[PDB]
Amino acid sequence: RKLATIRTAGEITPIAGAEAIECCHVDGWTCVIKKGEFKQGDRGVYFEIDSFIKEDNDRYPMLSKQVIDYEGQRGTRLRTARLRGQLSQGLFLPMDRFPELASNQVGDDVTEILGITKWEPPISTNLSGEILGEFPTFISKTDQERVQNLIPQIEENKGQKFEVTVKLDGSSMTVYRKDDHIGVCGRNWELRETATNAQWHAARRNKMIEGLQFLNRNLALQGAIIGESIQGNLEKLKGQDFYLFDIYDIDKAQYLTPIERQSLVKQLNDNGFTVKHVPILDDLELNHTAEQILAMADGPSLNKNVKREGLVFKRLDGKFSFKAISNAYLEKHKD
């Protein structure tokens, strides 16, 4: 994930309350900047929310009063914030503050060169087992790009049609089969079945192991586990359950399209395998800007009386996929 990249200043607009600052559009994001830091069309380094930036008075003095400890080192975590009434996200700095990047090009990922890293909520301790092996290379990891970083693609996909589903807030979990072996994995490892492992227990109680055996194909069930003991259980659940959102065809190396997934989950439940699916909302004919898509992010969740974290969109061909995280949710939750 490109936590710090080189980007272009979009349109700049005043903020009436405090004229020492102004509102700057970096592609889909809005920043508060110092007035006269950028004119539109200038390049700079933009750090995304969740960046953790080590303490530097020369380079990041504007971060000096939100310094925290994190996993041993001292630095600043970027979150959604409301600065003098203006909702602002990330940090945009001009290039004359980065001499060692003087001849980098727009679009470059300078995460590693600046030592940026990602602040992460601590381990949910009921969800970490013993590791049989790494995540299998013949399976794609579950990762969604943010719509604020895709404005060119949204204009390209004008006219395309997308499946819209609720984005649950839980940890990712993969159950798969390759020919005589059925494995359970979290985000980055394949785990051994214990009387401990939350993922194995989710897999066994909805029987997706015999289900995958039954279906007799090299498929990867990918879902979020959510519920008790998981990210504050904002969905008011009893227990923990598996909610699917993608199926990776291992042999063809590509995800199932929505209707294929939809009919395969149907096939699974028909034969008595209790695989739940992330909530599907009605499909979308993309004719939108990033702002309008974000504007759909707020709304009812799996529990219809709680505000969802956001939405994810899947182009029906199955090859284009992005999320749009609710900013109201991000503001009503700082961790």
Ligand X SMILES: Nc1ncnc2c1ncn2[C@@H]1O[C@H](COP(=O)(O)OP(=O)(O)OP(=O)(O)O)[C@@H](O)[C@H]1O
Closest of 141, 217, 221, 137 to residue 176, by C-alpha: 221
Minimum gap (Å) between residue 293 Cβ and ligand X: 15
> Can you tell me which residue has the tokens 């006219």?
159
Per-residue interface string for the shown chain with Mn ion, residues 49-88, x marking contact by CB under 5 A: ----------------------------------------
Q: Which is nearer to ligand X, 98 or 279 (CB)?
A: 279
From the list ligand X, Mn ion, none, which binds 172 (C-beta under 5 to 8 Å, kind-based)? ligand X
Longest dimension (CA), the chain: 66
Can you tell me the distance from the alpha carbon of 22 to that of 10, in angstroms, rounded to the nearest whole number? 12
Q: Which is nearer to ligand X, 183 or 186 (CB)?
A: 186
CA separation (Å) from 244 to 175, 206, 299? 10, 12, 20
Backbone angles phi, psi at 155, to 5 degrees: -70, -40
Q: Are strands 161-167 and 280-285 parallel, antiparallel or unpaired?
A: antiparallel
Site size with Mn ion, rule: CB under 5 A: 1
Minimum gap (Å) between residue 321 Cβ and ligand X: 8
Q: At what angle do helices 198-205 and 208-215 cross, to 10 degrees?
A: 60
Minimum gap (Å) between residue 315 Cβ and Mn ion: 18
Can you tell me the distance from the alpha carbon of 297 to that of 144, in angstroms, rounded to the nearest whole number? 15
Q: Which is nearer to ligand X, 15 or 297 (CB)?
A: 297
Q: Which is nearer to ligand X, 15 or 168 (CB)?
A: 168
How far the first Cα of the chain sits from its last, in Å, is 19
Minimum gap (Å) between residue 216 Cβ and Mn ion: 31
Among 134, 143, 285, 317, which residue sits at the site for Mn ion (rule: CB under 5 A)? 143
Minimum gap (Å) between residue 309 Cβ and ligand X: 8
Q: Which is nearer to Mn ion, 143 or 156 (CB)?
A: 143
From the list Mn ion, ligand X, none, which binds 157 (C-beta under 5 to 8 Å, kind-based)? none
The answer to whether 245 and 226 are in contact (CB under 8 A) is no
Minimum gap (Å) between residue 147 Cβ and ligand X: 11
Burial (0-12, 13-18, 19+ Cβ within 10 Å), 320: middle
Q: Which residues does residue 225 pair with via DSSP β-bridges, in sequence order?
A: 171, 242
**Residue with the shortest CB distance to Mn ion:** 143
Closest of 187, 194, 258 to residue 224, by C-alpha: 187
User: Rule CB under 6 A: which residues touch ligand X?
Assistant: 1, 50, 142-144, 165-168, 170, 172, 224, 245, 278, 312, 323
Within 10 angstroms of residue 242's Cβ, the number of other Cβ atoms is: 25
From the list ligand X, Mn ion, none, which binds 312 (C-beta under 5 to 8 Å, kind-based)? ligand X
Q: Which is nearer to ligand X, 21 or 318 (CB)?
A: 318
Minimum gap (Å) between residue 151 Cβ and ligand X: 17
Catalog residues that contact Mn ion under the rule CB under 5 A: 143
